[PDB]
From a paper:
Actin is an abundant and highly conserved protein that controls the shape and movement of all eukaryotic cells. Monomeric actin (G-actin) can polymerize into filaments (F-actin), which form a polar, double-stranded helix with a right-handed twist. F-actin exhibits two non-equivalent ends, known as the ‘barbed’ and ‘pointed’ ends. In contrast, both F-actin polymerization and disassembly are substantially slower at the SD2- and SD4-exposing pointed end of the filament.
For instance, the well-studied toxin phalloidin from Amanita phalloides is a rigid bicyclic heptapeptide that represents a prototypical F-actin-stabilizing molecule. We show that phalloidin rearranges the pointed end by binding in between the two terminal actin subunits, resulting in a stabilized arrangement, which explains why the toxin potently inhibits actin depolymerization. We indeed observed phalloidin bound in such an arrangement between subunits P2, P1 and P0 at the pointed end (penultimate phalloidin). Unexpectedly, we identified an additional phalloidin molecule between just the two last actin subunits (P1 and P0), directly demonstrating that the toxin can also stably occupy its ultimate binding site at the pointed end. While this binding site is not complete since the SD3 of a third actin subunit is missing, it enables phalloidin to act as a bridge that strengthens inter-subunit contacts at the pointed end of the filament. Strikingly, the two terminal actin subunits in the phalloidin-bound structure adopt a flattened conformation that resembles the general organization of subunits in the core of the filament, with the only exception that they display a disordered D-loop. Thus, while phalloidin does not majorly affect the arrangement of the F-actin barbed end, it induces pivotal rearrangements at the pointed end by bridging and flattening the two terminal subunits, which rigidifies their arrangement. These conformational changes are required since phalloidin would otherwise sterically clash with the twisted, G-actin-like terminal subunits. We show that phalloidin binds to the ultimate, incomplete binding site at the pointed end between the two terminal actin subunits, stabilizing the actin-subunit packing and inhibiting filament depolymerization. The penultimate phalloidin binding site that lies between the three terminal actin subunits P2, P1, and P0 overlaps with the binding site of the pointed-end capping protein tropomodulin32,36.
Author numbering:
A (entry chain J), B (entry chain K), C (entry chain I), D (entry chain H): 1 to 7
E (entry chain D), F (entry chain C): 6 to 375
G (entry chain B): 6 to 41, 48 to 375
H (entry chain A): 6 to 39, 50 to 374
The structure:
Amino acid sequence: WXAXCPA
Amino acid sequence: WXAXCPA
Amino acid sequence: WXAXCPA
Amino acid sequence: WXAXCPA
Amino acid sequence: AALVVDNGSGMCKAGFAGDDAPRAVFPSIVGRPRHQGVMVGMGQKDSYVGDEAQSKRGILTLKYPIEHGIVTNWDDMEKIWHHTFYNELRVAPEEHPVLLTEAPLNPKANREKMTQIMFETFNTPAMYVAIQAVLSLYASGRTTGIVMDSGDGVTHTVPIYEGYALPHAILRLDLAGRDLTDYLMKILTERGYSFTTTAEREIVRDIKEKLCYVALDFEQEMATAASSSSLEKSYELPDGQVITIGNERFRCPEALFQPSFLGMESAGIHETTFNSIMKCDVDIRKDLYANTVLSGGTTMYPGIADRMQKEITALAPSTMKIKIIAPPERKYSVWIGGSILASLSTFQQMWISKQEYDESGPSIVHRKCF
Amino acid sequence: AALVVDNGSGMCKAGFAGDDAPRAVFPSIVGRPRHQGVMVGMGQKDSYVGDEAQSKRGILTLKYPIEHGIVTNWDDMEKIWHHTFYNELRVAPEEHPVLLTEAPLNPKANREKMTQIMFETFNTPAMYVAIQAVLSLYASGRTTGIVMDSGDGVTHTVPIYEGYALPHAILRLDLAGRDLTDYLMKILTERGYSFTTTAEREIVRDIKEKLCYVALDFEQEMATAASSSSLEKSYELPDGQVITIGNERFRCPEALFQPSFLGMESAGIHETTFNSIMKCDVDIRKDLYANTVLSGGTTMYPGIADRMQKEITALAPSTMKIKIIAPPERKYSVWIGGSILASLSTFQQMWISKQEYDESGPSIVHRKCF
Amino acid sequence: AALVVDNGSGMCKAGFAGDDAPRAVFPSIVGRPRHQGQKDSYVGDEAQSKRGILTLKYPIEHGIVTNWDDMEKIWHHTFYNELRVAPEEHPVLLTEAPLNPKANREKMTQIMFETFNTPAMYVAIQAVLSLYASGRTTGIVMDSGDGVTHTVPIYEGYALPHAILRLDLAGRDLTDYLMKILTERGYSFTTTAEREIVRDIKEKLCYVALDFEQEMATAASSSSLEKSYELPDGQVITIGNERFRCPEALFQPSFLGMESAGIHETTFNSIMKCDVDIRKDLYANTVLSGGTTMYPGIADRMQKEITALAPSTMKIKIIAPPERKYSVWIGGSILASLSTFQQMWISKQEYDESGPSIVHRKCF
Amino acid sequence: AALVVDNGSGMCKAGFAGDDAPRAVFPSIVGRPRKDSYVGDEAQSKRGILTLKYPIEHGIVTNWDDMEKIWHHTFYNELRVAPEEHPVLLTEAPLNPKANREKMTQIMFETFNTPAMYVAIQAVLSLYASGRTTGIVMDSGDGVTHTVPIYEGYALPHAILRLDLAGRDLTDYLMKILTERGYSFTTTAEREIVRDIKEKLCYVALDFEQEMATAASSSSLEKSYELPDGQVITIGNERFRCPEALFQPSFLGMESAGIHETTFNSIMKCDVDIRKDLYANTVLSGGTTMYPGIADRMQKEITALAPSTMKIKIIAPPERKYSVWIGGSILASLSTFQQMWISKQEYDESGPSIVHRKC
Ligand SMILES: Nc1ncnc2c1ncn2[C@@H]1O[C@H](COP(=O)(O)OP(=O)(O)O)[C@@H](O)[C@H]1O
Ligand SMILES: Nc1ncnc2c1ncn2[C@@H]1O[C@H](COP(=O)(O)OP(=O)(O)O)[C@@H](O)[C@H]1O
Ligand SMILES: Nc1ncnc2c1ncn2[C@@H]1O[C@H](COP(=O)(O)OP(=O)(O)O)[C@@H](O)[C@H]1O
Ligand SMILES: Nc1ncnc2c1ncn2[C@@H]1O[C@H](COP(=O)(O)OP(=O)(O)O)[C@@H](O)[C@H]1O
Ligand SMILES: [Mg+2]
Ligand SMILES: [Mg+2]
Ligand SMILES: [Mg+2]
Ligand SMILES: [Mg+2]
């Protein structure tokens, strides 16, 4: 992801 | 609530 | 260590 | 060698 | 003087009668640390209540003691009241009467336990519980019109004419500002943002109160958002990473008017407001239509005053006139009405006296109270 | 025929429509040699993709293009798909339609580039994208039941009461097999084994698939393991060393039902299925309880079917019967559903034609594919 | 008077609590004469004096005790020769790296409770103790010792176990690497006796380059980066571009062949595993400790590397106390002298009834 | 027709590429009387009158004046072919000072002006001769002993170990034990005789304690060797004592580990997933390794250290003495190798530094 997690 | 929703 | 590295 | 051993 | 304590789902307000604004306004959350403590001498408290919880929300599991206007956990709400009555407002309740506000349609055990705790744990001299929607009229200074109360808690549309509230026309739509937060965080996953935690939900609440707005036409703004990229407003996160939201600014407010987006089968805000009027009599219908009053934190969206007027106008007859009155102090409309109510001399005989409660038991909240 | 593809965080299943088993199953990893080539006699390819990289994983920096069901790097996914069509299936996609799967609640840009790549790089006549968990009921031959899909990187439950899928209860948790593998080596250091490289990551995954299991009662089983009972097993590393794991056998799979071990506030796997059922209608719950269907590799632990049944029975009312269905071939359940869907005559009109994409660009995938 | 003993992989610091500096510090090396009234095993500073004869061997490797027969010798030397106090009346505090084998701390409790007869005991993480010395309460603690480099983020005293990262690359691994690239110039060191000569070189002349690519080209032409060192035997050696390559393995572990990321990336990943709401305070309160972070200019390089990865809006503040070499011990002095800590000592009776496993339940 | 030249620490090999055996082998010894200098077979024949001096010591050239003599002697006295037409594929031990290899590129590019040049690791070429691709290489030559593990062609630099125990050290150790029986030697010419005794009478015992007790209990292991003057000498326990110093360096006084432990420690420096392949493909090379039964003893010692389930297979072709050169012939004849040649134009643009960037 972009804002949140790594993905 | 008790029956319905979660409250 | 035991399984992995040396220590 | 230079520093250490002979060569 | 009395203590107008307007407890609510999002925040609870505390103060004194005769004032213009509440003295203490803090979030109504009770967080408990999950990570273990490693440093000695810091003296961390067992639980954090109010603004202290919000500051250290990164290591807490924020649980709201009130959900949908019903006190789910009665042990944490005793802590919130204790924090309200001792630290922020800082007056011993045993010397002053205490007034509370309560949703119109709610379980009768909720008002039952509210009286039991105050009259015994805090030993207040007197009490009175009023409807949150009704109190909005006192702030507006009018005895007629409907109040479209809607906040983090459950939305209410209570019509009152000449001070005689109509009970059969009261509607309780469970769609609220909290449901929009869940919907907004669900539709924000399309851009790659995943806020799924009790702490990150507070971040989503901040975005909704700042950049979100109501579009006059959903279909036209949908084309404008797709055609033009000028509807994007960057927002900065607490960690310093900026985010960009496009059509989600007005996509989440539109869930209020079309609850089909969240999957709920109930009608929207305008239909619920329209149905509240249609239940009333024909003769009084003229006055209640031109004196509608908004309230609560949900109705603070930019353009909701114009959008609601248009939707309710088409359903209503064309010759008739619609006047959406939107005061700028609608956030504290429930509290400000309480301040007027407590100072009135004709009402000071309506409190539940301490002796009266003991003789009749906790059931005194139905007859002596509202 | 249709080239049904089941790209995922772990191994990607690729084959043909109408078959009962995937033709080629290889890990979806891409690795490059970190060292420098010295021997010049044999070829040193820039990057090894698929089962080729697994054999020579010692000298490779394995990196997964997929993380939590989202394509993090689009350069490597082109390599994997090219390896699938031209090196495993040995067919040209220019003549055969391609079916693909995507996890629900995924970024809209993820499936936008998926359609873009095939329609311009591989030039397939048709395409379709379907939810991974939706196809799982097609393999089981049922039209009702909540799908508990648990892949390598995602764990999502989507209730399907009938031909219509409820969209307000499609939950999604990022706790899956990959996170468990990272947790297994975190608690393996408590015994003296240090796995800290991606080459050693694969060794840990083999241990999880062969020795890990779910205990019916975690607290009682903990006492038995602390007594040095027959729970201790022996596993042989590629080196030839023999390692013994005791209470770590059931501690790693226990992170699914108690995510607090991983520091995640999200509720357990048993609870997230309970929540999804509750958000459905009252009359619907009578069928979702009795038709729960597991899927994915992560639900291949011995005892996951019995343990989940006990947890749900406590939460659910006693009258309702919880019949957890665990097909013996649930590892490839998602692919088998895709094979059945493609062969159906009704599905022939759901394809995305090449001319259809040509007129509106990649935005079609949000209109036809659900 | 609670003792505070930090038995690190390198030199061990021992001294009383309530003071500001360790009472006695000496290398943790035990050596015996090579090949064939000299005593069998020389420990502590005595081994350093006769390092040209004895086979120097480190009892602790990568923060793990490898020979429990040797660790009894060093502890016997500290309590009876350096501090010269009887351990039978004072409590003893120990420091250990995080993510260590459970069998490591179990044996430490067994030894002192049975052999040294210490009435009390507590085991605390080295990173946590480092935060006490600075007087701070939050901020990640990048502790890099001789054999263990770990970053333990702490917010308001509530440690985050899932965000703790441990990397085996540390000061000792740099000593082997510097010895490897010294043979490139023409100087060869093979025996463990000559390793301590290399460690002397790394302490005095070795430093960190701000812009590593620009340093090679500049150092290739001019000899402004060449410094001359004097060997103990009288020989004078000159080392040029090797001065900055040795610590750059901290930031680019690919030189040693390790797949793990550098200290700058390890610190960045540790903060990322934490929540968003506490990333405000972790960026502005980063703390360094340990001898591996004592290179002149390492603080400046770390700030630049993290700022590139972190958003430009955020502020990266690398707190570098001047006494970060003894930060682990100094913080432990405050903990033992605190009145609140007196209820967490592992008394003899509790260990007697619960066995060696008590150390897991009463320590972090 | 690249002129593959392996300037080892004695017994340098040279010959045309594409063959299978070295064209000429002669000791890398330059001696002067105590003509002006003699090098090669003429020096060994007249070793009594000269003072033999090795230009190369421990794989490092200690004097470039003598190195030019043997190199001039190789192309103009043994091969009898000018080097102006063919490239040269030199060999150099790993982990050597850069000043050693920089001069090697410079000296021929200026004095001999060969069209091309290349420097190859002596351990890598050994694997080429056997045709294998995986498995560590034990290039225990003279002067130096190095292990360079290779897996699928990707040599791992962090696991390249270099040990200073080799044949020259063993010759000095065989010097000391022989003096205990009265067979003393002083001059460098006498030392060449001691190398002869090592080459035909030394063997690696399977174990000390059984053989040492046996050697002190009977005289079945006695061997009679005549020294080149005519008188015969008898050596006993020295047969299995000097060779075993490779495995127990404590006899020499050096602290480093033995041959078996150096191989054992080199493998653990590699990744776990490739240790299994290296254990079953160990390769041996070098003159020192030509001891009888060194593979059998190394098989046992590594097996004790390695896990029981592991399989140890010490591959050692019978012609392991010229393994480096044979591998060097294959590399020079490869079609793909013609691009890696260091051209004459590439030398002048970057000076002598071209050896580091291209090799
Ligand atoms: N300025 C604003 N603009 C848009 N939405 C707002 C604004 N302020 C509050 N809200 C919404 O209203 C909610 C607060 O409701 P509030 O009126 O405080 O409830 P209560 O009546 O129980 O105190 C918040 O959850 C937020 O979503
Ligand atoms: N028999 C098994 N037992 C436990 N875990 C398994 C088993 N087989 C596979 N897994 C784990 O499940 C993960 C997902 O694999 P799978 O569901 O087959 O494909 P996908 O990654 O596409 O969902 C793998 O990473 C693997 O670690
Ligand atoms: N002034 C210095 N400059 C650079 N490196 C140093 C300096 N002092 C010590 N070191 C290195 O730091 C390493 C760890 O030292 P120390 O902090 O005493 O270990 P410990 O982790 O046990 O506290 C030593 O091996 C040494 O090489
Ligand atoms: N058959 C043998 N027995 C014992 N030692 C030998 C034998 N052959 C060669 N050696 C020794 O091995 C050493 C190295 O020989 P070689 O491998 O030909 O040279 P280099 O070390 O240059 O490769 C020589 O010094 C020689 O003494
Ligand atoms: Mg309110
Ligand atoms: Mg899957
Ligand atoms: Mg330390
Ligand atoms: Mg050789």
